[PDB]
Design a protein around this ligand. Structure first.
Ligand SMILES: [Zn+2]
Lengths: 105, 53, 97, 72, 104, 105, 223, 230, 98
């Protein structure tokens, strides 16, 4: 009866300014977020070209990737509303010139 | 005003103990124990890192 | 008995098994007098229930007894019906089986 | 409950209902008498409680109170 | 399991409990009976207080019945429903029940 | 996110122009030259976001209203404003102003 | 029968941690001085901090410049964590910042005008992915904490102004312990601050405040 | 630079024999608690004075609390009566000795009895007990002086019922905090003290004496002189 | 309560914990078996920090008590109490027995 409420409640939780990882998790938060289109998973493996808080550029080494276009883009979404009037904005992680792989954040 | 450990750090929240036993959501206690542990392990690394980087 | 009939007035008198009367008719009980019932060994008396009042479309201030909420004889104007109604089904949210 | 309570007043008048009506009549009387000259109601209490105080201190003797309605 | 938590607590340099000694902040004299402490992740729920206050003095009224609106979206007006009538009855509170049904 | 709209009523077209009597240039100060708030103004609890007006008629005003019109030479305006104001108890700032015009014109 | 304490800065250590001491006390009064020091040291000491900022090509907090890995609100949060030291009688002034680099804009790049001080020299303010211009100001002001309620919203005048809330009091931890020496005790107070004040000055200031507040009970008059 | 406020309002009020209620007004937030703790503790446990410590009745011929004596009061009652005597010593002397050596005929007993030593001043006329004119009796009281609360380890060690030491005239502090407002800022404090003493000193001046102790314990670190000016 | 004469404002959850806690006893504690004249004495003592609050002491009391029949007889003497319970002696109004 108590875990029922503990589960029904943590989905009305309101996000805040600076996200802080839990210190006692269950290794499942790695899965939910990745498995919902709020993150930006790199399609092809390469190196960061130029990143700023509006878009990301990735040049792909075609040697170890299938036929590609040598450059792809990802456009960030700053302060887009959502049905409950909560702010949505993605923030980049990577730095200039980093080795990333297909299926990373 | 909050209670504070001997070191000097104060405590943020003051929950109530009478809740837990009656409505048997024990797991919260064990979560607090593990959390204390993690917070100790943090201060350890900090001490080792406040010198000789 | 000394708890079932606390604060309810007495229909008629009560005679000792030794002969002398003990409590008269129309004598509202009270935790002083309710010693005098288990004292002398009594186990049955006649009290004034609202089932046996005689007033039309109402209730007299004696066939009902003590207010049981202010410890006095019921003042005239207390809508007793509503009180008794909601003091029955209210705890019902708890009695389950 | 600043100073006076129903437990006090219930000693002179009775049934705790008659109290309501009698105090209401008295407070209405004290109100319509133009007591509202406005240099007093900001230093003391509303007449609704002045009447209760008056009945507690046993000054008015509500047997008298009704005799102020014929004074209407 | 428990003993793992406990070995970790030891590594950290804490009692083999959660419990520890605390001091009041208004005096400094400690509490007896060492108290539990910990981290205990916490959340805030979407039931803020800014959108539940809603008082009202006088506002619009219902077209077909001439009664106040309801919901704090327009201007509300708190439902003084049926069960609250029996309450004011049992009290014998005639007046406050009367003008609760006409003047208001 | 609020939104105001302008319809064609049977007395005429209503207007969102920043021109409404009985309104100073102070409550209007945070208004641009087009009837719409700036992008950045920290609006308050009850200021104008877009200022509108709608016409009316059928005064046949009371004798006392007539007199007081006749003292201060108070003219009776045929229009009434129905602007858009933040409801009380709120605050904040502005981040985007979408405006959709008319068709076939 | 006469003991009176003197104050000593024994046992410095760590980043900005210290252990101040008062050598002789009255054998019983120690645990009063300890608590008073702690509480007044945690509530009233005033410092200086940034309260209002204006960035160059910005209009509000939820915005974004070009070639900046950061955001505007992330920048405003960075700014709050700068440790500023002001001199005796400044009480208000202006800071400036204009740069044309292509790396990490640390707080050391504030203009080295008079009076001011910037202790937290490592703290990043923003990261410029590419070379570009960047400029802003920030009004530094003295102040003390008062609670989340009795704080005035710090009026804004210009267009791009952006209020920044300010945590003034420079104390982070206090804890005391009392040691017995025979008809006498010694008080041993831990203090940890951001580095914007010196410990001895700090404790002296706190005791000044405290005795100032006590000095009414010597009179039992109004003032 | 906003000039931490000052009380600016006092309402002294006496309500019993050696008892008074002071109330202070408009103190900055939380200050009330610190100023209450300091005041209460130092006024209670760090004031100089003299007080009785030990009682010997019949030179040791009363061992426990269950021994009849030729008067109306059991031993416990006499101990409790004598423990209350308000004595003022002298600076030159460092110990007193109250002697209630009595053999009369069923009399009333008070402080105006009891041949003493030099330097004492019984300060009152508290009643003790009622003689029964029976067999002989004696009472020996020991009086010392100092500061602090000296706890007695054992109750009756050898031949004297030992007590613990008060060493103060102030017998009660019991302070409290309430709320008060000075306008737009309403989170402030309002303190109320309730002191009850023994008679050796009127309450208020005892309060002042305890405040002077603190304000005197910093002269080498603060300027207690200029704080007076204002 | 209108349903039954039982009161309805009794302390409930941890107002009860504290009372039950400070009103227990302990066998070997500090200051055990001491002597005190009145409540203020026990207060002064306990704030000094020598006694354990669960100790057994002896207090001499004297106060009126109301009888059933409207009498009010005096009660006095020495009673073996606990340091905790005496701390509650102040709140009990004159009229109820200790
Ligand atoms: Zn009947």
């Amino acid at each position: 009866n108590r875990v029922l409420m503990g589960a029904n409640m943590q989905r009305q939780a309101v996000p805040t300014l600076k996200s802080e990882k839990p210190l006692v998790g269950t290794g499942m938060e790695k899965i939910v977020a990745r498995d919902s289109g709020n993150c930006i998973i790199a399609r092809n493996v390469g190196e960061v070209a130029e990143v700023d808080s509006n878009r990301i550029v990735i040049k792909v080494d075609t040697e170890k990737s299938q036929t590609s276009n040598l450059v792809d883009i990802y456009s960030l979404t700053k302060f887009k509303r959502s049905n409950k009037n909560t702010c949505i904005n993605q923030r980049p992680i990577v730095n200039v010139g980093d080795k990333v792989e297909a299926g990373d954040i | 005003d909050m209670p504070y450990m001997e070191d000097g750090t104060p405590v943020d929240v003051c929950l109530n103990p009478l809740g837990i036993p009656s409505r048997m959501n024990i797991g919260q206690i064990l979560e607090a124990h593990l959390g204390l542990a993690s917070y100790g392990l943090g201060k350890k690394i900090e001490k080792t890192l406040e010198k000789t980087r | 008995l000394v708890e079932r009939a606390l604060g309810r007035t007495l229909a008629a008198d009560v005679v000792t098994e030794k002969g002398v009367v003990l409590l008269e008719a129309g004598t509202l009980l009270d935790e002083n007098l309710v010693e005098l019932l288990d004292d002398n060994g009594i186990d049955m008396i006649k009290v004034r229930s609202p089932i046996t009042c005689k007033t039309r479309r109402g209730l007299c201030a004696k066939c009902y007894g003590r207010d049981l909420a202010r410890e006095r004889q019921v003042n005239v104007g207390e809508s007793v019906g509503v009180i008794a109604a909601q003091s029955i089904g209210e705890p019902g949210t708890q009695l389950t089986m | 409950m600043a100073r006076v309570t129903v437990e006090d007043c219930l000693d002179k008048v009775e049934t705790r209902f008659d109290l309501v009506v009698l105090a209401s009549m008295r407070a209405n009387k004290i109100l319509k008498n133009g007591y509202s000259e406005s240099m007093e109601n900001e230093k003391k209490e509303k007449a609704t409680v002045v009447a209760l105080r008056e009945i507690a201190e046993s000054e008015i003797t509500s047997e008298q109170i009704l005799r102020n309605e014929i004074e209407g | 399991k428990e003993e793992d938590i406990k070995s970790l607590l030891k590594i950290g340099g804490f009692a083999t409990n959660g419990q520890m000694k605390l001091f009041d902040g208004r005096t400094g004299k400690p509490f007896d009976r060492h108290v539990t402490v910990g981290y205990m992740y916490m959340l805030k729920l979407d039931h803020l207080v800014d959108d539940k206050m809603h008082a009202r003095s006088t506002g619009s009224y219902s077209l077909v019945t001439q009664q106040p609106l309801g919901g704090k979206a327009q201007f509300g007006g708190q439902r003084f429903g049926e069960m609250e009538v029996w309450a004011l009855q049992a009290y014998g509170a005639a007046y406050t029940l009367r003008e609760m049904l006409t003047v208001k | 996110e609020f939104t105001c709209v302008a319809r064609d009523t049977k007395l005429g077209p209503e207007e969102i122009t920043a021109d409404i009597p009985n309104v100073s240039e102070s409550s209007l100060a945070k208004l641009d030259e087009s009837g719409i708030v700036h992008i950045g103004a920290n609006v308050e609890a009850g200021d104008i976001l877009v200022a509108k007006i709608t016409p009316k008629a059928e005064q046949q005003l009371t004798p006392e209203e007539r007199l007081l019109r006749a003292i201060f030479n108070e003219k009776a305006s045929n229009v009434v404003d129905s602007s858009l104001r933040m409801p009380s108890g709120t605050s904040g700032t502005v981040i985007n102003v979408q405006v959709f015009e008319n068709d076939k014109g | 029968l006469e003991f009176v304490p003197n104050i000593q800065l024994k046992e410095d250590l760590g980043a900005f941690s210290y252990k101040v001491q008062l050598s002789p006390v009255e054998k019983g009064m120690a645990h009063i001085l300890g608590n008073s020091i702690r509480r007044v040291l945690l509530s009233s000491l005033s410092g200086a901090s940034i309260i209002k900022v204006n960035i160059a090509n910005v209009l509000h907090e939820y915005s974004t410049l070009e070639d900046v890995k950061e955001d505007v609100v992330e920048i405003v949060s960075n700014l709050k964590k700068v440790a500023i030291k002001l001199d005796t009688g400044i009480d208000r002034l202006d800071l400036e910042l204009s740069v044309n680099k292509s790396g990490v804009v640390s707080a050391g790049d504030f203009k080295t005008t008079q009076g001011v001080e910037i202790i937290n020299k490592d703290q990043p303010i923003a990261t410029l992915t590419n070379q570009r211009a960047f400029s802003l100001t920030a009004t530094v002001s003295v102040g003390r904490n008062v609670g989340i309620l009795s704080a005035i919203p710090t009026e804004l005048e210009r267009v791009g102004d952006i209020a920044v809330d300010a945590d003034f009091n420079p104390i982070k931890r206090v804890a005391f312990e009392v040691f017995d020496n025979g008809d006498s005790e010694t008080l041993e107070v831990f203090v940890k601050t951001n580095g914007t004040i010196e410990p001895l000055a700090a404790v002296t200031k706190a005791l000044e405040y405290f005795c100032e507040q006590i000095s009414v009970f010597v009179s039992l008059r109004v003032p | 630079l906003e000039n931490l406020l000052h009380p600016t309002n006092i309402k002294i009020d006496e309500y019993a024999k050696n008892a008074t209620k002071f109330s202070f007004e408009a103190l900055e937030r939380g200050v009330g608690y610190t100023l209450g703790f300091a005041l209460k503790q130092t006024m209670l446990y760090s004031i100089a004075g003299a007080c009785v410590t030990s009682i010997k009745i019949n030179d040791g011929k009363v061992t426990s609390l269950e021994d009849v004596i030729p008067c109306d009061e059991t031993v416990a009652d006499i101990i409790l009566n004598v423990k209350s005597l308000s004595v003022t010593l002298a600076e030159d002397v460092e110990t007193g000795t109250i002697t209630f050596e009595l053999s009369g005929s069923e009399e009333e007993i008070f402080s105006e009895e009891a041949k003493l030593s030099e330097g004492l001043a019984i300060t009152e006329e508290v009643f003790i007990c009622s003689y029964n004119g029976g067999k002989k009796l004696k009472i020996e009281a020991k009086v010392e002086k100092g500061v602090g609360f000296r706890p007695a380890q054992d109750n009756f060690k050898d031949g004297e019922f030992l007590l613990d030491a008060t060493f103060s005239p102030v017998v009660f502090c019991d302070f409290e905090i309430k709320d008060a407002r000075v306008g737009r800022r309403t989170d402030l404090d309002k303190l109320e003290l309730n002191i009850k003493t023994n008679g050796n000193v009127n309450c208020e001046e005892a309060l002042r004496l305890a405040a002077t102790k603190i304000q005197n314990q910093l002269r080498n670190i603060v300027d207690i002189e200029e704080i007076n000016k204002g | 309560s209108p349903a039954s004469g039982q009161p309805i404002i009794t302390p409930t959850q941890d107002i009860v914990l504290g009372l039950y806690y400070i009103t227990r006893e302990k066998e070997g504690a500090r200051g055990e078996g001491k002597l005190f004249s009145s409540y203020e004495d026990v207060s002064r003592a306990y704030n000094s920090g020598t006694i354990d609050i669960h100790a057994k002491i002896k207090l001499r009391i004297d106060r009126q008590v109301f009888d059933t029949k409207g009498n009010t007889y005096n009660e006095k003497g020495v009673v073996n109490t606990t340091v905790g319970r005496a701390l509650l002696l102040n709140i009990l109004p004159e009229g109820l027995s200790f």
